[PDB]
Enzyme design. Structure first.
Site, mmCIF file in Angstrom:
data_model
loop_
_atom_site.group_PDB
_atom_site.id
_atom_site.type_symbol
_atom_site.label_atom_id
_atom_site.label_comp_id
_atom_site.label_asym_id
_atom_site.label_seq_id
_atom_site.Cartn_x
_atom_site.Cartn_y
_atom_site.Cartn_z
ATOM 1 C CG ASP C 60 -2.074 0.768 0.679
ATOM 2 O OD1 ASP C 60 -2.353 0.601 0.204
ATOM 3 O OD2 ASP C 60 -2.178 1.982 2.053
ATOM 4 C CB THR C 93 -2.609 5.846 -1.271
ATOM 5 O OG1 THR C 93 -2.527 4.062 -1.472
ATOM 6 C CG2 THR C 93 -3.972 5.099 -0.643
ATOM 7 C CB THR C 94 0.591 3.940 -4.987
ATOM 8 O OG1 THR C 94 1.490 3.790 -5.501
ATOM 9 C CG2 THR C 94 -0.064 2.793 -6.303
ATOM 10 C CG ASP C 391 -6.013 -0.743 1.038
ATOM 11 O OD1 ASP C 391 -6.419 -0.399 1.568
ATOM 12 O OD2 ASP C 391 -5.664 -1.516 0.602
HETATM 13 N N1 LIG Z 1 -5.621 -7.802 -13.788
HETATM 14 C C1 LIG Z 1 -5.428 -6.085 -13.979
HETATM 15 N N2 LIG Z 1 -4.931 -6.361 -14.992
HETATM 16 C C2 LIG Z 1 -4.473 -4.773 -15.171
HETATM 17 N N3 LIG Z 1 -4.465 -3.958 -14.521
HETATM 18 C C3 LIG Z 1 -4.830 -4.314 -13.491
HETATM 19 C C4 LIG Z 1 -5.491 -5.304 -13.045
HETATM 20 N N4 LIG Z 1 -5.752 -5.327 -11.155
HETATM 21 C C5 LIG Z 1 -5.797 -3.754 -11.081
HETATM 22 N N5 LIG Z 1 -5.371 -2.344 -12.313
HETATM 23 C C6 LIG Z 1 -4.874 -2.321 -11.951
HETATM 24 O O1 LIG Z 1 -4.085 -1.588 -10.854
HETATM 25 C C7 LIG Z 1 -3.755 -0.232 -10.447
HETATM 26 C C8 LIG Z 1 -4.186 -0.837 -8.934
HETATM 27 O O2 LIG Z 1 -3.413 -1.103 -7.885
HETATM 28 P P1 LIG Z 1 -2.901 -0.398 -6.878
HETATM 29 O O3 LIG Z 1 -1.833 -1.250 -6.403
HETATM 30 O O4 LIG Z 1 -4.397 -0.386 -6.358
HETATM 31 O O5 LIG Z 1 -2.848 0.913 -6.474
HETATM 32 P P2 LIG Z 1 -4.174 1.971 -5.508
HETATM 33 O O6 LIG Z 1 -2.556 1.803 -4.182
HETATM 34 O O7 LIG Z 1 -3.282 3.456 -5.702
HETATM 35 O O8 LIG Z 1 -5.170 1.489 -5.241
HETATM 36 C C9 LIG Z 1 -5.829 0.352 -11.029
HETATM 37 O O9 LIG Z 1 -5.363 1.343 -11.076
HETATM 38 C C10 LIG Z 1 -5.927 -0.770 -12.050
HETATM 39 O O10 LIG Z 1 -6.430 -0.511 -12.899
#
Ligand SMILES: Nc1ncnc2c1ncn2[C@@H]1O[C@H](COP(=O)(O)OP(=O)(O)O)[C@@H](O)[C@H]1O
Ligand SMILES: Nc1ncnc2c1ncn2[C@@H]1O[C@H](COP(=O)(O)OP(=O)(O)O)[C@@H](O)[C@H]1O
Ligand SMILES: [Mg+2]
Ligand SMILES: [Mg+2]
Lengths: 300, 536, 526
Positions: C60, C93-94, C391
């Site tokens: 996170d 957040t990221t 989350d």
């Molecule tokens: N199976 C997948 N294939 C492609 N992109 C994905 C998949 N699952 C999630 N994502 C992308 O990854 C991002 C989520 O990353 P994450 O580490 O949760 O970031 P944050 O902490 O900012 O929410 C989202 O923008 C989503 O579009």
């Protein structure tokens, strides 16, 4: 026999005082922080910060509704202790003393309308708490006055004061004169305290000697000295029964004396710096004494 | 060190005069870059990493560590302007410093400071007279849109400047909502009755104007309901705790049987008080004191809302809005202990709203009086604080415009008009006060010059065009409509600011001129400084 | 002495000009680069060393940024916006940090080209309004009554976390907890998962054994061993007042002169305890739970009536118990009522896990508070699992409040970028260039996903942009695992509209705030 410690001061403890309920210990420190913590649970009941620093004068009212404090500011003020929880204690400040030198010690009377201030100007002053004006001065010691203690049991309208003048003199507010004078310590006078009966009083001096004077004979009674102790005593007090002579010393330890005998009954220590104050709790069950070691431990 | 024999330093004449001018110039230059719509904010790291992002001149000068006495004089000048007007804090400092600089330049030419001071006083008096006589617009003609334009002008150069179309409406609505009238029919607008709550999260456009009041408090116990359909608000100024006997009362027990009854009464007193307050019909209870557990349980069982440790000013505002009556004791003139229904405030709703992981009380549609509150949403805490400062400035400006119905064109129009008029007027007043008034007029041009410089434009050309326009207006009787011509910083060209809706309250300019003149006179009055060595 | 004279105090530095803007933008870019490689399903864990001596294995972004101490105030602003994003919506957040860094990076280009920051800020705000419009346009509704859609949304929320291995169990736990906590009273909907959805981490066991209870759990034991540790259908009475004998508020002194007064006082203390216990017993409960101590004599009197007592329970735990079992906490037992008695707990179990006793009030009927029991390898693993569950629950709450969804995997970013670029063609002033700059700076999310996946960035972004230039291709993004362009109508990665709106708003507003800033002043005291 230390039973608890009180770590609430940023600088060295200079003076303290007790209360009639045995739960409102107040003190003054070098920084200017005054705390009125409870005696048992070691929790700050309420605290105030003096605008100046180097305050070694602090007294607690017998009724408990006010406190007095002062130091190198040439000032003595009264802080009322009304409940008034939604108030800053700095607002209720009452400037009282108009001094030309640092206030060595201040104390209340049995009635909370007068305060006696001993300062470095060589004069002790009496101030009316309510009106705030000077009652009368006490010309006397040709040098600094350090200690000041009120007599118990009507006070006889009398009090004793000592300092680097090498003598302790007894006054009388009814006439404003030095009724009695004792000059036998061969050193600076630090502390003084009446005997519980009120007709005698002990005094600590920088020559590490504790002397007991009887007012019914105008001569010293008992010498309390040892070749082991070479650092002058800074505080002295009597037990409730009047048989012990709890005295604070600059040798980091506390020397216990016997009023009748003075045969080195006991001794205690623990502080890491000079002991500045030593007072006996009104109930007489326990006592306490602060020190320059930033702590104000309590012995039971 | 000489025969004077004083334990300190001593600077006399031109040396100390130049030192004072330099200090004033330094203070001016600190804030000179944050003037006008093209100004920029400033970070103020507080020696422990605390960050303050601001454009307000008073905040910048208050947070800074200032040691020179003249620099202080300027700092407290800004603080006074903020306290008594609320806007123009940067302008007054800049004007005062420029006035002092030009006055010292005159003095170095062997012009006596008394003559310069007399000229400055005459120029200030005539400038105020000219402003009040020729450069004012009556806001009654322009209607409500004048308030919107004034708020938008005040919020330019702030972090909410681009969002003015929305923030001005919010400010005007709040100020009109908190309006109340007193005796003799004077309508006064008590700003600071608009509670402003900051909470990061959603965007700026999602900031809400509450049609009521907003408390930064929550219910004391989770067992109470968190919403009341029809609130019967009762305001108390005393704590609801286990009653204890005061200092003059003691409990001495000789017969041990009475101890249980005494201990029972010790809480039955508070129970009876709460029972009376609930029996009058109250739904929401707000108190400035604490509430312990048993009283909270009584309120929970009664199905009421109880809030503790409410701020005194918040309680006063709520009581005024809802018609409630603050009670410090439940005592009447009959010597009894009663609570009456006639002293209950009412509102259309009380809600435990949730705002970005934290909750707060919303008191909506208080009856018998209209109240307003603003909840500001931003990216983080610093931005919310800057939003609050800008919002306060806008509220103050709207209050000034409503109380005094005169406004003046902004964007340096007043400064240029005053410069031309005072330059023309100086020729008929004395011989050296002529120079003093001319320098006053020239110093008044520092505002449009700073505006143009901050926009990275030709300051000289723009100021020359403005001066030509205002000279033509003052010379030709038929061209008197050119007085409103100011500066368009977006395009860097002169523009009729009255049509553009760039307005400021007349009080801002008048008070800034008076305070700047007084500060300049005070500093110019010094020709010798003695700095005693500290005794520490 | 003749000490030097100076206007401001010493140690009071001041910077100004282009240096300040460049430093602010560089600090923001550095903050972004710290966690750039933690975005997507193929993100790598980061290992943080707590100053107190702990270790934080986490992915996170908010945790990483809140465990990092920085000196540049722009970095402080970035940390603050990360915390804001975490608190407001619960995830993203990221993403917001990377977005803000990219917008500031593309604004530096215009700052260096004699463009005043106000113009850039105006363009940014116009772009933000158009992003909000486009995001609301390309959203789709979702039936909140469909469990499969809820589980799929939570899965898409946790595919990027370390709990992706047990995604099915995690989704079921999060959905059940959020649906259970949801409550309505006085016409006010409320989902308070920070108070009534407790997560308890007991190290050991297996993570597949972790489950959400239909009740609550506390680390408490019976005060006396004779009390029953297993009650079938207990009637629960909750208290927040001591069942002991305590001094009154007023100062009270007894004056004993007769012989029997001392014994009489002690006997009346015992009788007062007995009276309190009799008042408690009058309701005929089965378990009594108190926040304050229970005296031994009170324990004896309660065991006389076959009542189990739990001595000292925290306020929050007692509130959760009240919500779960339908009780009402009362202070004075003499005012105890039948309605305050909590019936609804279907079982009270007190079993030993490892070497500690844990109390279970599970098997409740219609509970409004839950305890998520987490069992795992160790403390750090369980802490990360708790963060991922938080989350998931935040995402579930966001979807419940806002039932709209937008495509994930960078599809939304590309769609909004294309819409903004197409809208910019009408613009003719100098504001169009920063407008398009923000439009294409929004593309950093799919670019970062492709970089983390390990595929070629340039050709994948070019092909994705070409695909998005078509008509019905708003849902075309990338795979974070295979690095190929796919349709989120087929891949099934969707995100709440509220999360994306908050992310865009926070990023643009952070960029605006840091662009407004010039002339840093530091060193002054309070
Ligand atoms: N199976 C997948 N294939 C492609 N992109 C994905 C998949 N699952 C999630 N994502 C992308 O990854 C991002 C989520 O990353 P994450 O580490 O949760 O970031 P944050 O902490 O900012 O929410 C989202 O923008 C989503 O579009
Ligand atoms: N839209 C605008 N166009 C031109 N000038 C403006 C505009 N808004 C404000 N100004 C001018 O900018 C000047 C600076 O105001 P500002 O510095 O924000 O007030 P303060 O001095 O209280 O900070 C004001 O004198 C005002 O006349
Ligand atoms: Mg302004
Ligand atoms: Mg996520």
């Amino acid at each position: 026999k230390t039973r608890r410690t009180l770590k609430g001061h940023g600088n060295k403890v200079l003076c303290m005082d007790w209360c009639k309920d045995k739960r409102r210990i107040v003190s003054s420190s070098q920084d200017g922080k005054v705390i009125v913590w409870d005696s048992f649970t070691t929790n700050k009941e309420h605290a105030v910060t003096m605008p100046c620093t180097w305050v070694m004068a602090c007294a607690y009212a017998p009724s408990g509704c006010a406190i007095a404090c002062g130091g190198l500011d040439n000032k003595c003020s009264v802080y009322p202790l009304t409940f008034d929880k939604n108030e800053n204690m700095a607002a209720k400040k009452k400037s009282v003393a108009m001094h030309t030198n640092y206030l060595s010690a201040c104390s209340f009377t049995n009635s909370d309308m007068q305060i006696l201030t001993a300062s470095g100007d060589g004069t002790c002053a009496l101030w009316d708490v309510e009106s705030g004006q000077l009652l009368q001065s006490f010309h006397g010691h040709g040098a600094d006055v350090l200690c000041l203690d009120l007599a118990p049991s009507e006070t006889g309208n009398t009090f004793v004061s000592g300092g680097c003048d090498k003598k302790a003199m007894v006054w009388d507010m009814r006439s404003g004169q030095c009724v009695q004078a004792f000059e036998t310590h061969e050193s600076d006078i630090n502390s003084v305290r009446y005997y519980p009966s009120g007709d005698a009083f002990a005094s600590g001096s920088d020559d590490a000697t504790c002397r007991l004077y009887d007012l019914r004979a105008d001569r010293e009674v008992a010498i309390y000295s040892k070749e082991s102790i070479i650092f002058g005593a800074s505080s002295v007090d009597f037990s409730l029964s009047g048989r012990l002579l709890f005295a604070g010393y600059n040798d980091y330890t506390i020397n216990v004396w016997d009023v009748l005998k003075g045969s080195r009954v006991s001794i205690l220590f623990g502080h890491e710096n000079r002991v500045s104050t030593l007072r006996v709790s009104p109930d007489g069950t326990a006592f306490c004494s602060g020190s320059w070691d930033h702590t104000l431990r309590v012995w039971a | 060190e000489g025969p004077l024999s004083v334990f300190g330093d001593r600077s006399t004449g031109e040396t100390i005069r130049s030192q004072n001018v330099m200090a004033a110039a330094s203070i001016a230059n600190i804030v000179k870059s944050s003037l006008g719509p093209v100004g920029l904010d400033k970070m103020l790291v507080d020696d422990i990493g605390d960050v303050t992002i601001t454009n307000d001149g008073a905040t910048i000068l208050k947070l800074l560590e200032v040691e020179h006495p003249a620099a202080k004089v300027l700092c407290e000048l800004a603080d006074l302007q903020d306290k008594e007007v609320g806007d123009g804090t940067t302008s007054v400092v800049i004007i005062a410093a420029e006035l002092l600089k030009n006055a010292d330049e005159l003095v170095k030419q062997k012009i006596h400071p008394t003559s310069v001071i007399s000229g400055y006083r005459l120029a200030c008096k005539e400038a105020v007279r000219y402003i009040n006589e020729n450069l004012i617009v009556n806001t009654d003609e322009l209607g409500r849109d004048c308030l919107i334009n004034a708020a938008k002008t005040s919020m330019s150069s702030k972090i909410i400047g681009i969002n003015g179309d929305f923030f001005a409406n919010m400010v005007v609505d709040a100020v009109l909502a908190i309006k109340y009238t007193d005796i003799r029919g004077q309508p006064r607008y008590p700003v600071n009755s608009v509670n402003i709550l900051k909470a990061h999260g959603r965007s700026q456009m999602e900031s809400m104007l509450i049609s009521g009041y907003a408390l930064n408090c929550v219910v004391g116990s989770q067992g109470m309901p968190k919403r009341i359909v029809n609130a019967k608000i009762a305001c108390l100024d005393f704590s609801l705790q286990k009653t204890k006997m005061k200092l003059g009362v003691q409990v001495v027990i000789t017969d041990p049987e009475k101890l249980d009854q005494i201990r029972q009464r010790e809480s039955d007193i508070t129970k009876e008080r709460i029972q009376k307050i609930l029996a009058t019909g109250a739904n929401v209870i707000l108190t400035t004191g604490g509430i312990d557990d048993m009283c909270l349980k009584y309120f929970v069982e009664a199905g009421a809302m109880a809030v503790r440790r409410v701020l005194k000013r918040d309680l006063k505002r709520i009581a005024k809005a809802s018609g409630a009556t603050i009670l410090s004791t439940l005592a009447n003139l009959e010597g009894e202990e009663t609570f009456e229904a006639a002293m209950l405030g009412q509102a259309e709703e009380v809600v435990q709203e949730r705002i970005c992981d934290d909750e707060l009380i919303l008191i909506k549609n208080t009856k018998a009086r209209t109240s307003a509150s603003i909840i500001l949403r931003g990216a983080n805490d610093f931005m919310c604080d800057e939003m609050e400062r800008s919002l306060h400035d806008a509220l103050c400006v709207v209050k000034r415009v409503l109380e005094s119905k005169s406004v003046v064109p902004g964007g340096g129009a007043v400064e240029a008009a005053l410069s031309i008029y005072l330059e023309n007027y100086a020729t008929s007043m004395g011989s050296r006060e002529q120079l003093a008034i001319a320098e006053f007029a020239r110093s008044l041009l520092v505002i449009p010059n700073t505006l143009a410089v901050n926009a990275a434009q030709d300051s000289t050309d723009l100021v020359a065009k403005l001066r030509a326009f205002h000279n033509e207006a003052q010379v030709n009787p038929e061209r008197k409509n050119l007085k409103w011509i100011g500066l368009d910083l977006s395009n860097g060209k002169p523009r009729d600011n009255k049509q553009a809706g760039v307005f400021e309250p007349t009080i801002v300019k008048v008070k800034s001129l008076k305070f700047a003149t007084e500060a300049a006179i005070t500093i110019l009055r010094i020709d010798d400084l003695i700095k005693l060595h500290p005794e520490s | 002495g003749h000490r030097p004279v100076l206007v401001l105090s010493q140690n009071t530095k001041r910077e100004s000009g282009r240096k300040v803007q460049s430093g602010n933008i560089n600090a923001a870019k550095t903050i972004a680069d710290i966690i750039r490689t933690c975005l997507g399903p193929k993100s790598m864990m980061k290992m943080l060393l707590d100053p107190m001596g702990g270790i934080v294995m986490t992915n996170d972004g908010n945790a990483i940024l809140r465990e990092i101490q920085v000196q540049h105030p722009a970095a402080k602003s970035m940390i603050e916006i990360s915390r804001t994003q975490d608190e407001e919506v619960g995830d993203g957040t990221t993403s917001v940090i990377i977005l803000a860094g990219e917008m500031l990076s593309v604004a530096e280009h215009f700052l260096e080209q004699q463009m005043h920051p106000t113009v850039v800020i105006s363009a940014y705000r116009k772009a933000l309004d158009d992003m909000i419009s486009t995001l609301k346009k390309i959203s789709i509704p979702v039936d909140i009554s469909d469990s499969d859609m809820m589980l799929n949304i939570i899965n898409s929320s946790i595919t990027t976390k370390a709990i992706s291995r047990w995604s099915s169990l995690a989704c079921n736990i999060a959905l059940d907890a959020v649906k259970m906590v949801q409550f309505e009273e006085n016409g006010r909907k409320e989902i308070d998962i920070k108070k009534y959805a407790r997560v308890e981490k007991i190290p050991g066991g297996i993570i597949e054994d972790s489950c959400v209870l239909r009740g609550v759990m506390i680390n408490k034991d019976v005060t006396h061993p004779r009390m029953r540790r297993y009650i079938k259908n207990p009637r629960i009475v909750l208290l927040d007042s001591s069942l002991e004998y305590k001094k009154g508020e007023s100062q009270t002194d007894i004056e004993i002169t007769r012989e029997e007064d001392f014994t009489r006082i002690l006997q009346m203390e015992e009788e007062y305890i007995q009276q309190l216990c009799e008042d408690i017993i009058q309701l005929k409960p089965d378990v009594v739970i108190t926040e304050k101590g229970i005296s031994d004599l009170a324990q004896h009197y309660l065991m006389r009536a076959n009542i189990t007592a739990i001595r000292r329970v925290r306020k929050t735990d007692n509130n959760r118990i009240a919500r779960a079992c339908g009780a009402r906490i009362v202070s004075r037992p003499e005012e105890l009522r039948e309605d305050d008695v909590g019936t609804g707990a279907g079982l009270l179990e007190i079993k030993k896990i490892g070497d500690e006793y844990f109390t279970f009030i599970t098997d409740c009927k219609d509970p409004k508070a839950c305890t998520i029991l987490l069992r795992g390898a160790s403390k750090e693993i369980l802490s990360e699992v708790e963060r991922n569950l938080q989350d998931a629950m935040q995402v579930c709450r966001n979807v419940l409040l806002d039932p709209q969804l937008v495509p994930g995997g960078g599809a939304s970013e590309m769609a909004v970028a294309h819409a903004l670029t197409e809208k910019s063609k009408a613009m003719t002033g100098v504001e169009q260039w920063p407008y398009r700059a923000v439009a294409q700076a929004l593309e950093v999310i799919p670019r970062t996903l492709i970089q983390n996946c390990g595929a070629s960035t340039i050709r994948l972004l070019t092909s994705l942009r070409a695909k998005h230039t078509q008509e019905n291709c708003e849902t075309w993004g990338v795979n974070g695992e295979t690095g190929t362009l796919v349709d989120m109508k087929e891949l099934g990665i969707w995100e709440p509209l509220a999360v994306k709106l908050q992310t865009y708003k926070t990023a643009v507003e952070t960029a605006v705030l840091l662009l407004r800033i010039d002339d840093i002043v530091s060193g002054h005291k309070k």
